[PDB]
Amino acid sequence: IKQGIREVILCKDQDGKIGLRLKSIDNGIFVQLVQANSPASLVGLRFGDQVLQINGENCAGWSSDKAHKVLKQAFGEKITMTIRDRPFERTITMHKDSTGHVGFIFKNGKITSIVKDSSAARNGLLTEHNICEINGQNVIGLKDSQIADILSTSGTVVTITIMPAFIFEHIIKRMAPSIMKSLMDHTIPEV
């Protein structure tokens, strides 16, 4: 998580899409969805990113509707955004034991217990936090089984990016749990 504000320059694709859904939260605007293979994923926009400006206009107090309408009207050629990096999230670095374990139990992407004497205990992993990313890979909407899969196939150093569940439940409200699985960019980024 950059303790960092950055500018991103976007280009609408052939269909005039950028591949973003935005959500009003506490009078900011946050990324609810980044569509795979969109302009938004190529410039590296992430779930939970705050959008401060669109074309140098402040987003403060905009409805989810108004932010979508503003995006729909922009001169497609070039859209500037000012982004604050995943402000509701933190990253935690853990090491698997020889039995392959970091030392927690999750359900529907939510950490529900921390296993005593584990790397997760030693690093202060919290319960009631949704898993947003693993080693910088978005995993939101993946079945629990494919999250554990990605953990097994991870090396011994595991980075997890988490969000308080109240905040997570507030952002994804009114996106069907199938569009989360279906269309949320779960790809490793391109270079």
Cite the annotated binding site by residue number: 108, 143-144
* Cα–Cα dist 32/46, whole Å: 9
Beta strands in the chain (DSSP E): 5-10, 20-25, 28-34, 50-54, 57-58, 79-84, 90-95, 104-107, 110-114, 129-134, 137-138, 157-164
DSSP class of residue 98 equals: T
* Cα–Cα dist 168/176, whole Å: 14
Number of C-beta neighbours around residue 57 at 10 A: 12
CB neighbours of 17 closer than 8 A, spacing ≥ 6? 35, 38, 39
Q: How many residues can be counted in the chain?
A: 191
